[PDB]
Design a protein around this motif. Structure first.
Motif, PDB file in Angstrom:
ATOM      1  N   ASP A 130       0.818  -1.248   0.000  1.00 50.17           N
ATOM      2  CA  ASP A 130       0.000   0.000   0.000  1.00 50.17           C
ATOM      3  C   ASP A 130       0.837   1.275   0.000  1.00 50.17           C
ATOM      4  O   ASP A 130       0.346   2.317  -0.459  1.00 50.17           O
ATOM      5  N   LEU A 141      -6.951   6.004  -6.361  1.00 52.18           N
ATOM      6  CA  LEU A 141      -7.521   4.806  -5.754  1.00 52.18           C
ATOM      7  C   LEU A 141      -8.544   5.179  -4.728  1.00 52.18           C
ATOM      8  O   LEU A 141      -9.651   4.688  -4.787  1.00 52.18           O
ATOM      9  N   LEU A 146     -11.630   2.147  -3.987  1.00 53.66           N
ATOM     10  CA  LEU A 146     -11.727   1.514  -2.692  1.00 53.66           C
ATOM     11  C   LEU A 146     -13.168   1.655  -2.272  1.00 53.66           C
ATOM     12  O   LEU A 146     -13.645   2.793  -2.140  1.00 53.66           O
ATOM     13  N   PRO A 157      -5.893  -0.569  -0.274  1.00 50.47           N
ATOM     14  CA  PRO A 157      -5.544  -0.983  -1.618  1.00 50.47           C
ATOM     15  C   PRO A 157      -5.278  -2.488  -1.738  1.00 50.47           C
ATOM     16  O   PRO A 157      -5.627  -3.104  -2.751  1.00 50.47           O
TER      17      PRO A 157
END
Ligand SMILES: Cc1cn([C@H]2C[C@H](O)[C@@H](COP(=O)(O)OP(=O)(O)OP(=O)(O)O)O2)c(=O)[nH]c1=O
Ligand SMILES: [Mg+2]
Length: 720
Positions: A130, A141, A146, A157
């Motif tokens: 991560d 992300l 997510l 992640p």
């Protein structure tokens, strides 16, 4: 004595392991972060204030972005459960708290595979990975990839990647773990739909769809419209072949009236794209240039949710170049011009001409310059060469291919009964450069084998928005493996984009991908049998993509032996390779898009209300390590639109290496495209960057691309 200016410096210093401390200076962050004021503030506002502050210093050195990401990630980590199986459980048990209704965010079947193997799956994950995104790739992300509960991120992640892997590989835990490791280490990424929807109910895992208009009738037109609206429901880009619809003023037998043409029809398609945007749908509309409405089509966008493309036959291009006339036709008077290509098109078209079944005659060059005038204003239409697309397609035996997709990389067969589907992934080409400046071709191949096997499994799990999509995919099983970070690979090898060193690496990279891909596709055929329409295909006759381009591969890979493997077993997939735009996934892995060179050496990212200036990270390392970098120079580079070519203090070797795309010959760009193109069994998304448009120069780029054999001559035109 007051003091307490370090204290927080130490907290920042803690996460600077491995960064270049000659340029990273934690105290600089603290000077802005302090001004932290407050009596009622705690350890959560800084972390977010220090991460933002570090991120604005990305312009002083790239490791500030790595530091910003660590701060932001470690912060996310303490607002997140560690255990993967527990995040999946909470995602499933989600009760939408104000409709009352149980609204699971992962599929029960996924969670059940997860809970059945939690010990192995929970412990396979390595959360320090991560920390391997840079701030801006992490914020991307966090924004979309997510899963959230309450508007508060629940997935790390790592958790997302493991979901994706289990989503794809189901009860095959070995596979799921292997794919987890490849993804978390960044050797490749699946396309955005797959990252959003694997492991969920509604696994819409594909990227784009291609349709042919059903028939030339209100009935036909509105079935297709419906199909488009249903596809748009499920993260769909769309390409639509529209050339069989009759022209303006053509006779309608049943109402004794006159057709309204393409334009007002397309108004409906345009509003359907605006309307069905999950709640920003885009359709690409493909026209052949013999269609009588061609001029009105090239003048419309001057239809904001439609994107326009010409599906161009060689004859049109020959007619333009030899200054002859060009006959415009109504497909209802002159049927089947879109069902046929090459010789058989040229002969049938010529035959309608000899019959005087022609609705208007223009000089081919009048239409030619209408086209390039269109491209100057909007940068559209996209230029595709119908005959190249068909002549060199392994789907040939299915019939004539009528169009490509939204981004011009996909050349697949479509029909009344079949909607073509794009199942996509990309390889991160920069990751295969060794610390010794050599290219690891054997690892590239071995990774491409894994991607093939994953894309095949996706074909079989995908939720299809219409049954014609499902039918298409299961019959021919095509897949689209692309790349990202080619420019970055060149730079990490120290090759100027136009150098002979890059031109060979470019050819070898793509020999390698096609090789591995074919190798896995053949291994899958051994296990499961060739795809249903394989007998007949050019590959079933021992002909591979490069043979259709009359190219001989380099000595790098033994093609003789693969051909023997393919001759014996067949292949599982009708098509394998298609370099797509990679806009969103390149921004996550921190590479440059696709096959494109760096468009500029300085660029901005938005992150919510934030605006950040980024310097080409390879460049900024080179400039900082040579004691050349300061603010007055950054501003010179901005003042030259991201170029470093007129800055006298930069040595000429770096100047060669950091040419922007504006400064690199587009002829070379188109050439390298043809050279790797011999190993790309679909097409590639290829923009042309010409600094200031010059009708003569553009015509000359088009004809060069066409003559080089490119399927896609031009995606977007960019002028600056
Ligand atoms: C009915 C209608 C058709 N059209 C166009 C769209 C279709 O491409 C084309 C044919 O529509 P159709 O609905 O096929 O008309 P038709 O059943 O009379 O068929 P034909 O003339 O083939 O015997 O005419 C209009 O532009 N406006 C209209 O109101
Ligand atoms: Mg009719």
């Amino acid at each position: 004595e007051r003091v307490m200016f370090d204290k927080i410096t130490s907290r920042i210093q803690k996460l600077c392991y491995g960064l270049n401390m000659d340029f990273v200076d934690p105290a600089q962050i603290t000077m802005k972060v302090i001004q932290g004021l407050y009596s009622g503030v705690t350890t959560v506002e800084l972390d977010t204030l220090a991460a933002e502050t570090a991120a604005t210093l990305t312009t002083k050195h790239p490791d500030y972005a790595i530091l910003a990401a660590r701060i932001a990630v470690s912060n996310l980590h303490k607002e997140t459960k560690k255990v993967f199986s527990d995040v999946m459980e909470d995602l499933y048990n989600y009760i939408n708290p104000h409709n009352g209704k149980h609204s699971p965010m992962v599929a029960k079947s996924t969670l059940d595979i997860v809970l059945a193997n939690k010990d192995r799956l929970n412990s396979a994950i390595i959360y320090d990975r991560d920390f391997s995104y840079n701030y801006f790739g992490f914020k991307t992300l966090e924004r979309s990839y997510l899963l959230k509960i309450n508007g508060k991120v629940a997935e790390r992640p790592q958790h997302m990647l493991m979901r994706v892997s289990v989503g794809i590989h189901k009860e095959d835990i070995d596979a799921a773990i292997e794919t987890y490791n490849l993804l978390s280490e960044r050797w490749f990424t699946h396309a955005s739909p797959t990252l959003f929807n694997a492991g969920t109910n509604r696994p819409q895992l594909s990227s784009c769809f291609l349709l042919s208009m059903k028939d030339d009738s209100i009935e036909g037109i509105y079935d297709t419209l419906k199909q488009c609206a249903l596809i748009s429901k499920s993260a769909g880009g769309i390409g639509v072949a529209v050339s069989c619809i009759r022209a303006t003023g053509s006779y309608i037998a049943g109402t004794n009236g006159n057709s309204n043409g393409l334009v007002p029809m397309l108004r409906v398609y345009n509003n359907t794209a605006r309307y069905v945007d999950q709640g920003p749908g885009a359709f690409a509309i493909y026209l052949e240039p013999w269609h009588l409405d061609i001029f009105e089509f090239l003048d419309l966008k001057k239809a904001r949710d439609l994107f326009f493309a010409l599906w161009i036959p060689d004859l049109f291009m020959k007619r333009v170049e030899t200054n002859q006339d060009w006959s415009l036709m109504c497909p209802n008077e002159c049927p089947g011009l879109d069902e046929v290509w090459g010789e058989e098109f040229e002969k049938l078209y010529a035959s309608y001409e000899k019959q005087g079944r022609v609705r208007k005659v223009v000089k081919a060059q009048q239409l030619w310059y209408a086209i390039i005038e269109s491209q100057t204003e909007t940068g559209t239409p996209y230029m595709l060469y119908k005959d190249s697309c068909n002549r060199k397609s392994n789907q040939q035996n299915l019939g004539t291919i009528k169009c490509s997709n939204l981004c011009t990389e996909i050349v697949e067969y479509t029909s009344k009964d079949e909607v073509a589907v794009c199942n996509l992934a990309s390889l991160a080409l920069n990751m295969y450069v060794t610390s010794e400046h050599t290219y690891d071709f054997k690892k590239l191949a071995e990774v491409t084998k894994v991607v093939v096997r994953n894309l095949n499994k996706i074909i079989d799990i995908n939720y299809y928005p219409v049954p014609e999509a499902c039918l298409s995919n299961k019959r021919h099983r095509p897949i689209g493996i692309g790349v990202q970070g080619l420019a970055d690979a060149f730079i990490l090898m120290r090759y100027p984009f136009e150098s002979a060193e890059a031109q060979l690496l470019n050819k070898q990279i793509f020999e390698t991908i096609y090789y591995g891909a074919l190798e896995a596709s053949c291994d899958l055929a051994k296990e499961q049998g060739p795809y249903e329409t394989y007998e007949g295909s050019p590959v079933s006759k021992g002909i591979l993509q490069y043979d259709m381009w009359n190219v001989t591969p380099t000595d790098l890979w033994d093609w003789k032996v693969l051909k023997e493997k393919i001759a014996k077993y067949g292949i599982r997939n009708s098509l394998l390779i298609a370099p797509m735009p990679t806009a969103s996934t390149a921004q996550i892995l921190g590479n440059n898009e696709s096959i494109e060179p760096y468009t500029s050496n300085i660029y901005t990212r938005r992150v919510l209300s934030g605006e950040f200036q980024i310097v080409n990270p390879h460049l900024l390392k080179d400039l900082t390590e040579r004691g050349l970098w300061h603010e007055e120079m950054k501003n010179q580079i901005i003042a030259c639109n991201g170029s470093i070519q007129s800055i006298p203090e930069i040595p000429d070797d770096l100047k060669q290496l950091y040419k922007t795309v504006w400064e690199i010959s587009q002829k070379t760009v188109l050439k390298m495209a043809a050279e790797r193109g011999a190993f790309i069994d679909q097409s590639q998304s290829l923009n042309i960057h010409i600094a200031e448009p010059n009708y003569g120069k553009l015509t000359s780029m088009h004809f060069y691309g066409w003559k080089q054999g490119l399927k896609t001559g031009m995606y977007y035109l960019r002028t600056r």
